[PDB]
Design an enzyme around this catalytic site. Structure first.
Site, mmCIF file in Angstrom:
data_model
loop_
_atom_site.group_PDB
_atom_site.id
_atom_site.type_symbol
_atom_site.label_atom_id
_atom_site.label_comp_id
_atom_site.label_asym_id
_atom_site.label_seq_id
_atom_site.Cartn_x
_atom_site.Cartn_y
_atom_site.Cartn_z
ATOM 1 N N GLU A 42 0.728 -1.255 0.207
ATOM 2 C CA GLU A 42 -0.103 0.083 -0.042
ATOM 3 C C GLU A 42 0.764 1.211 0.169
ATOM 4 O O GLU A 42 0.984 2.008 0.901
ATOM 5 C CB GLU A 42 -1.085 0.044 1.105
ATOM 6 C CG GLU A 42 -1.704 -1.140 1.256
ATOM 7 C CD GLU A 42 -2.665 -1.496 2.575
ATOM 8 O OE1 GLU A 42 -1.954 -0.627 3.622
ATOM 9 O OE2 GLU A 42 -3.842 -1.895 2.688
ATOM 10 N N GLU A 98 -6.424 -10.781 -0.489
ATOM 11 C CA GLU A 98 -7.007 -10.505 0.808
ATOM 12 C C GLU A 98 -8.569 -10.633 0.715
ATOM 13 O O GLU A 98 -9.135 -9.783 1.586
ATOM 14 C CB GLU A 98 -6.617 -9.211 1.574
ATOM 15 C CG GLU A 98 -4.975 -9.154 1.644
ATOM 16 C CD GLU A 98 -4.482 -8.172 2.568
ATOM 17 O OE1 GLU A 98 -5.449 -7.718 3.456
ATOM 18 O OE2 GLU A 98 -3.507 -7.516 2.391
#
Lengths: 357, 356
Positions: A134, A241
């Site tokens: 991220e 995820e």
């Protein structure tokens, strides 16, 4: 009868995230399911900087070591999560021994020493690393993270991170991982970053789209466009995820930050709206969840040639992070197994997808 | 057909006014204030950060204009907020050296402030929102800057009203708060009014802000609140009424800067949070009409306990409810639309006093 990993054998790895409790054998019911259904594992938390290196000079691999050991007993594809990340990394990583900020040089050394100790510790045991996690913002620009500030430059941060990962784990595959990776502007930014890594000559094997999605987001169009874009770079695409938010507000878009952790949302008039399914999912919402997981895997199976792995974020609902995040104390239903470790209507749908010729 | 005329035999029916209405820049809204309302509350110009921006610097220009505008058509003047944790500059709680004020230093700051604001408008302001939003949702005192500096919750409220009574004997002294309908919060306000009267300090009314929505609160809770505040021998007022119609915010009252986060400006959220950009759909306007209808029906039924009902704004476009809590949204919380036209809700409100 027929498991997930079996049904998706000819397309991609079907994986899950395991917590400390599955590895310890405490959550034995979920452990059993990991053996039945999954051929790839990701440690949920125990391999993050703050667990691995809690304080300056102090290390802790005890729980990470257990996870890897756990992964061998079922010959699982092991994913390391995660080396460089602005979250869950103790403040000492960015300060000198005095408390003063690290210099770019000092900051890059910390990165080297950390990856060396973590990625180096696990060779031929861990098959892949979420190297950087991220870093790209919603408009495609670099996030002004603690790393980016202290190293100085977004490109330099990523460039070294993979360089160090390729050094101390030459065997292991290297991934970039991010949420909202379906977003055109963000996706484009990620692409520009992979392309700079490739042209700088550094190793990157795949792009991971986290897939913390919902009933109302995002479009299969956005997702297919991103799968294609990443695939066009000659790197693996992975859904890493995956989970489907069903609760009000959080089924409309992914929420970051701690705004929803505010005490006001625990109040009667908000808890009625935000936490409405405290005694099981209504039949209709359960069915929506089924059809959502179905249509999503139908697209995954359609693009199986470009995807290497699909990992759901957990086994059973009762230990999903979506219960307490972004609103603490709620009752979400985001995974494939109920709180009695029984297959939800969505599981049978997911299993059935590859059988459609 | 006028609002104040319909509700003449019950309570004052007023509104909040902004700088644009006062200066005459919004002549459209201005003309509708004279025709419809008999009470006015200054929306911002009397708040601490405007009145006293910097240390030993004062500014009453816009506040003076509000008072002048009020006498133009002789209306009940409500001065908005003397002691409040929000919209009050940081210098109020520190010395010139930057040290945090002692109990004594802070009460002096409180005294000097109320003397400057309340004292300036004796005979001209009819009522003051002396203390604003000091009780928490559980009924205890909020650990606000004021509370911390003075040291004790009671000591704050006691002194604020005392200083208001000294520097403005002519004026009425109110407590105003949001979520006042909530039993846990209600009982805390009751304890607070009880302690003020026990100390022989003047307090004339409790103000229920009334920043409500379609799905909150229950008419049960609202009535029980009016009843409870009334039995204390004080006036009960709805001081800042509006109806939130947009998603999430129509479910409950939100505070803080959580929703101002840049992620809610993103397309997938703007699609959920800001649906009615092209206009309020028929069925939602029906809901809004009905919502206003039942609430005013209740207000009229309890008129011998209510002394004032004020909406927080005239026309939809001025309403804070657009950009708060989510910046850049199109909300429809008031009785007049963006063309300054009466909404179906208005008709319903005006018809209440003469209905079976």
């Amino acid at each position: 009868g027929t498991s997930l990993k079996q049904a998706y054998a000819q397309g991609f790895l079907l994986g899950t995230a395991v917590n400390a409790d599955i590895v310890s054998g405490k959550d034995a019911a979920s452990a059993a399911l990991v053996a039945c259904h999954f051929n790839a594992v990701t440690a949920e938390n125990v391999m993050k900087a703050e667990v691995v290196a809690p304080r300056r000079g102090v290390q802790d691999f005890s729980a990470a070591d257990a996870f890897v050991a756990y992964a061998q007993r079922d010959r699982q594809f092991v994913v390391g999560h995660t080396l460089v990340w602005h979250n869950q990394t103790p403040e000492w990583f960015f300060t000198t021994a005095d408390g003063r900020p690290n210099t770019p040089a000092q900051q890059l050394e910390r990165m080297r020493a950390h990856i060396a100790a973590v990625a180096g510790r696990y060779t031929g045991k861990v098959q892949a690393w979420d190297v950087v996690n991220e870093i790209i913002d919603e408009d495609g620009s670099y996030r002004s993270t603690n790393w980016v500030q202290r190293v100085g430059d977004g490109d330099t941060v990523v460039r070294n991170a993979f360089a160090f990962a390729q050094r101390y784990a030459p065997d292991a595959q290297l991934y970039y991982n991010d949420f909202n990776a379906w977003r055109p502007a963000k996706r484009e930014g990620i692409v520009r970053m992979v392309k700079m890594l490739q042209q700088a000559g550094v190793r990157i094997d795949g792009v991971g789209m986290q897939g913390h999605w919902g009933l109302n987001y995002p479009s299969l169009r956005d997702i297919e466009d991103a799968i294609d874009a990443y695939a066009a770079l000659g790197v693996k695409v992975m859904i890493t995820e995956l989970d489907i938010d069903v609760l009000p507000l959080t089924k409309e878009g992914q929420i970051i930050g701690t705004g929803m952790a505010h005490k006001q949302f625990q109040l009667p008039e908000f808890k009625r709206f935000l936490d409405p399914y405290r005694d099981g999912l209504p039949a209709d919402v359960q069915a929506q969840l089924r059809d959502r997981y179905a249509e999503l895997f139908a697209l995954f199976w359609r693009k199986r040639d470009k995807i290497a792995r699909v990992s759901v974020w957990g086994v059973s609902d009762d230990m999903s992070w979506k219960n307490d995040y972004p609103v603490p104390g709620r009752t979400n239903y985001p995974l494939l197994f109920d709180r009695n470790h029984q297959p939800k209507p969505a599981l049978d749908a997911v299993v059935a997808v590859p059988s459609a010729t």
